[PDB]
Amino acid sequence: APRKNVRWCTISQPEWLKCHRWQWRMKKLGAPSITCVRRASVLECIRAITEKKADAVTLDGGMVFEAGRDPYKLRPVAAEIYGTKESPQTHYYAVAVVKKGSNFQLDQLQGRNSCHTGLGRSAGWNIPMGILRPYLSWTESLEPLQGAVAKFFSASCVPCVDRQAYPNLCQLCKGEGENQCACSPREPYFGYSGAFKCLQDGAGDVAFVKETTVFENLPEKADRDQYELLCLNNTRAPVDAFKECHLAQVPSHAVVARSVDGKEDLIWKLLSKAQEKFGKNKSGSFQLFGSPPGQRDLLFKDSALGFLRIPSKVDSALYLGSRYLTALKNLRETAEEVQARRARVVWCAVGPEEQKKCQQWSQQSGQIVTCATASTTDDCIALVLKGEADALSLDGGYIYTAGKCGLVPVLAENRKSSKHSSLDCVLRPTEGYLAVAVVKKANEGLTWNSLKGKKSCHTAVDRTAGWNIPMGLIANQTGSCAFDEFFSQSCAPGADPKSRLCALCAGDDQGLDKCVPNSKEKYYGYTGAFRCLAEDVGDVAFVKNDTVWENTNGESTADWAKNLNREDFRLLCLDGTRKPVTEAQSCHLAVAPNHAVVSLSERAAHVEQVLLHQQALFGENGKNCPDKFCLFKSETKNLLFNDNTECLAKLGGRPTYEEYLGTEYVTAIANLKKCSTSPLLEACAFLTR
Ligand SMILES: [Fe+3]
Ligand SMILES: [Fe+3]
């Protein structure tokens, strides 16, 4: 079928020859047929793929980044595994190898001859330029990195550069005629082994490659001895010392496919079969990870142990990692364009309504705070990881997911409290909020023991009050992991839209975006889920004490709420009792930990300082609060923060997400998550690999 086979993109004749040799041994094994597409440059394949002319190609990390940028939107589906069968690695090292006997060090490359694997490649270009930036004397306001580099080295061979604009950089290249500097193996000194040969042939003084390049080209140690590495501290060392003498560690190459309609599973079915039949140390007629004499790294890096399947949620940015992603980014942006990015705090807004409140806050703040937006909290978390956003306030259940991804609590949302009216809000200890089950008095006979079969309203899936606590307790008493099988129907924003957990959700004013986990969905959040109950859409709602009081007896003023009486409602206790909504202290399901602001540990220090100041202006008793703008007031819609919040308190020290949530709650969620797999959670385990 037009999708029952994978078309592989090749950028050279031998690669094409290898591909056909691969396609041949494949059918004999009966697997998704392999079609081979011919091309002449890496770009051509990237473009070819996104244009549905091909489905797969293995790319270097720096090309993987470039492939994920909007025009193409490609994504890593499988990572090459290196190292050894007992000690595998999914990363490698960028080293600078030089002929033993020379004298120059890292800080003396000026005027030398250079050998690069290719332009935009991890080891051959990205890492070095990063390290060598201080000595380059480059001004983006005058010319591009290439210009600076062309004025640094006297001559080199950086395949792919423009021999017309920057001849200086294609001199040492050995390509024949038009092939000179070609961005493909059509150029001898192209790739890892090419740049190495560029050095071996004494054309250049340095070769920027990876740790294994030497051991792959020179087997007899006697030969190796003639070569050394350049260490960061400006000293040389033997090539087997790369673990100590390296410029940087980078992520392995990856196979990339289309983001949408990419044949992922098909590509992976083939690779997993291919590696199991013709992998390392495996059958020796045809080697998947080997190229004929004089040929190298055809299709896949030579001597790779195999592949690793990449989870659906990790895209190019995530796959590369914060460290590498930052480095690459610093290469494409201005020096101040980056300083600006660091001086400001980028808030992540979830939905159109929160986005609007944020754009407002941004204006009032003076542009110190800026905004980024996502349709879901999970997406905002990913944005913070990629460095697109700095922070946001998360419910306890989300702090577990953000925690499982390395984000940390910074300040906690402090609701005005009766107790401890002794201290000031910013240093006042946090007192959780009570999660409760509310029902309508009229709903006779409905107690905790009779929730089975009823209809339910939940703030959203994965949140404390509306999900973790209720479903946690229901799972323990039910034994089963089937929650969508407990209630006949419900509204739990975030669940499968085609599921019955979304069968009672509204969507926006036009019935659109039904079940979407953001304020656009009528029955989302504390207030949304309460309204779901009030309107008789569900038999029970799972919210917190505060919600009942804030939207009854005319405290909301919103149509559905203005005429609601708190005496019309009751709370379901765990002892099978119903109680007036004034009996919360004795009739709650659990006391949850306050919502809090998270961020990357390396950014936390900054975010906090900016926040404590912001809140001094638009917080409860801020300079311009009533009059110009109030941070914790969103007209009962709880946008960005809860409306009943007085301030954001210091967490006293630097608790981890586990410390903040409490052991009790953490395991509770943990055991419940054992019933379901969360894409972001999977993607995150992989982030630590
Ligand atoms: Fe590489
Ligand atoms: Fe909550």
From Swiss-Prot:
Binding site for hydrogencarbonate 1: T117, R121, A123, G124
Residues the entry annotates as binding Fe cation 2: D395, Y433, Y526, H595
Family to which this protein belongs: Belongs to the transferrin family.
Coiled coil: none
Keyword Secreted annotated: yes
Name of the encoding gene: LTF
Organism: Bubalus bubalis
Protein name: Lactotransferrin
Biological processes annotated in GO: antibacterial humoral response; antifungal humoral response; bone morphogenesis; innate immune response in mucosa; iron ion transport; negative regulation of apoptotic process; negative regulation of lipopolysaccharide-mediated signaling pathway; negative regulation of osteoclast development
UniProt-annotated binding residues for Fe cation 1: D60, Y92, Y192, H253
Positions annotated with a glycan in the UniProt record: N233, N281, N476, N545
Biological role stated in the UniProt entry: Transferrins are iron binding transport proteins which can bind two Fe(3+) ions in association with the binding of an anion, usually bicarbonate. Lactoferricin binds to the bacterial surface and is crucial for the bactericidal functions. Has some antiviral activity against papillomavirus infection. N-terminal region shows strong antifungal activity against C.albicans. Contains two BBXB heparin-binding consensus sequences that appear to form the predominate functional GAG-binding site.
Keywords annotated in UniProt: Disulfide bond, Glycoprotein, Hydrolase, Immunity, Ion transport, Iron, Iron transport, Metal-binding, Osteogenesis, Protease, Repeat, Secreted, Serine protease, Signal, Transport
SMART domains: TR_FER (SM00094)
Any one GO cellular component localisation term in the record: early endosome
Active-site residue numbers: K73, S259
Domain called Transferrin-like: residue spans: 6-333, 345-674
Lineage: Eukaryota, Metazoa, Chordata, Craniata, Vertebrata
Disulfide bonding pattern of the chain: C9-C45, C19-C36, C115-C198, C157-C173, C160-C183, C170-C181, C231-C245, C348-C380, C358-C371, C405-C684, C425-C647, C457-C532, C481-C675, C491-C505, C502-C515, C573-C587, C625-C630
SUPFAM superfamilies (alphabetical): Periplasmic binding protein-like II
Subcellular location: Secreted; Cytoplasmic granule
Entry EC no(s): 3.4.21.-
